[PDB]
RNA sequence: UUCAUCUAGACAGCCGGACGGUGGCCAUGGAAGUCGGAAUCCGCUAAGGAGUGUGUAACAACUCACCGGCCGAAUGAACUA
């Protein structure tokens, strides 16, 4: 489901609590896995801007809580290197929740969206207000 | 008429293409099958342009345009701006726009005559849209959503809107847009109707998983529908 | 599904090795849903209250409402019933299948 | 579409063989013993199943 | 009722009208024809039983005018054809059978698969 | 031009499903093909097998039924198996039935062709009680009168 | 080791023929010797089954039963270590 993306710096390991950018009632997401992650002894699998993570809701609507459901990172605080040269980074981490196809459950996104997420996922760019 | 096709394996066409009355825009990473949809049906009337915007392939959601003009965001480079000013005709004007709201496609829903913009867009853009596109600008939201370009496909004839939309507010917009409006779903139950499909006067292209009752609703409000080769020879 | 049963001593076999002697038609509603292949993936096991079967017939019928939907908009409920086949066997406490381990 | 004069021409190379039961080898249909050594030249042969 | 048309998806070409459609509506539902039988190599031996589907997923039409150069040129017993503007596999022709997905038999068959084609009314819009 | 002697089997009223595939490369028809078959099976029973051949060129109809097989012995009768087991009074009309049958049977006239249509009739009662095997072994009827 | 075949022509192979009522009849989308049920008839023949197997959607084609010559001293089966 996930296409080709150039490697960017991994800023979100397992156990991170990122914000929730959409309007599906959830307040923050708790990352428990990264889809397509590697395998190394004692290594925590880490996420990045645009990866697809399995995540639970720790705060928000009680209907959304206590179930594991996939999510997509839209902002990142660790600085990454774009190919055209610049090192950039947002202010906080953020994610939106999705079905395992990649379609989005929320209606809109507040805050800016990273550009390598809008190219990779077609639904996130449809609901994005500001692209970087 | 009502042709269906898809970019690489995605149903949404409005993200990856921008179809107007006098030109067309497509992203560069396409197969031979996706390009042959527009080339076979538009012919040589309007110029098809392969382009990218801001280093992206989402040019249907970054740009905003109609018959008379095109608006591109700030991160569009000078190499991509000089390419568009050649391939498009001399009638259309291309203008770079300085925004905090970068994605102009989700923000602006426009045609030849009447445009709806996001309510938190600023006044220096409202002066810019009305003088470049030559369109009256109306600040208004689709009943529950601020992204008016993603959830409301619009043409000169009619306009398809978000499915969860009250009838009492459709009559508001039809009073404002002066075109008849129908709510519906495209791509087998996706509420994002502006990003699923594109439209102009003589063509409307949507995704491959658009079902047959959904395709009836599209061509009806847009009024693009209308035989001797078929017959019995026994 | 299949549920094991002590014909003499009235016990129930759990999947690994257990022999939980439960009261008949009171809390066997609660001991079955561990043995069932289906996990917590089904929506919200919102309710479960089994319906009557004949006491001579060796089967148990149950009803339940999973109620949690994710069909892209809403959470629409759904009601269904499944059946269980009772199988009797020995349970070596109740079988006496005797000689080293005397301790 | 296959023109069964040519289907009989191809089935001699594909279907009309025999299979050893022990080593699963592909053998000629008139054979009596398997030609390999890792099954010990065994003679328990079966015909190959037709479609 | 009114006449209808069968337009090709991704071609937008009218392949077949009504005044066609030999619809053969009832399946048999009995054990010899309503079920799909897979025998064995020998001795009339049933290995599989498959139940037929709900609705007949084809359109059995008369041989039409646009089909004629594929049926005159290299005339064979079975094959397939396409839309005349996209070269996509729409339906096959067969002078044997291929009952329906739902199962009867037909006649020598000109089947038009209802996957990747759709049916629209020939009259005006419904105006909902 | 071109001649083509095909074939046709079974049917009582109309059928030709098997043949229908034979007219694929040939002249395509469904209406006149069952109509030309209807001109063949006119006043023929639909229970019985009707074996025929049709010769055609540019939709040409042919209806011939040589009947040198069991088609004759099923014709002169009254209509997990519909039993054809009858006590037929054939022996007088079987002298007339073998007359139409022995067009070439390639035997020395009727006396060696009175046993072909006899054992071809593999069901009927014939004349009297039985008319099969030893009940029609020695033929002392008509015979040389037909020669 | 024990059987059995063969110069009175084997085994192995090659060369010919295998016809005519006839796509026999019910049975079925279709079954012509060969998906199956039950009958086993008759013509001609040197000899030839309402067919021994391979096959085709159904035929065809081919093989086998059976009849002829062509070839020239070996061959088949079980078993023991």
Numbering used by the authors:
A (entry chain i): 6 to 137
B (entry chain X): 1 to 226, 230 to 237
C (entry chain V): 53 to 150, 152 to 156
D (entry chain z): 77 to 127
E (entry chain Y): 225 to 352
F (entry chain L): 10 to 88, 96 to 163
Give excerpts from the publication:
Ribosomes are the molecular machines that all cells depend on for protein synthesis. In the cytoplasm, the pre-60S particle follows a hierarchical pathway of assembly events coordinated with the release of biogenesis factors. Using cryo-EM of 60S precursors trapped from yeast, we captured six intermediates in late nuclear and cytoplasmic 60S assembly at ~3.5–3.8 Å resolution, which provide unprecedented mechanistic insights into 60S maturation.
To capture a series of particles downstream of the ECL particle, we partially arrested ribosome biogenesis in vivo with diazaborine, an inhibitor of the AAA-ATPase activity of Drg1. The pre-Lsg1 (PL) particle contains Nmd3 with the NTD interacting with H89 similarly to the ECL particle; the Lsg1-engaged (LE) particle contains Nmd3 and Lsg1 with the NTD of Nmd3 rotated to engage Lsg1; and the Rpl10-inserted (RI) particle contains Nmd3, Lsg1 and Rpl10 with the NTD of Nmd3 remaining engaged with Lsg1. H38 is retracted away from the eIF5A domain of Nmd3 to adopt its mature position, where it makes extensive contacts with Rpl10 (compare Fig. 1f with Fig. 1e). Additionally, there is a subtle (~10 Å) yet important retraction of the middle portion of H89 towards Rpl10, which drives H89 into its mature position to stabilize Rpl10 in its binding cleft between H38 and H89. Unexpectedly, Nmd3 remains in place in progression from the LE to the RI particle, suggesting that the insertion of Rpl10, alone, is not sufficient to displace Nmd3 as previously proposed. Release of H89 allows it to reposition upon Rpl10 loading to stabilize Rpl10 in its binding site (RI particle). Because the P site loop of Rpl10 was not resolved in our structures, how the P site loop drives Nmd3 release remains an open question.
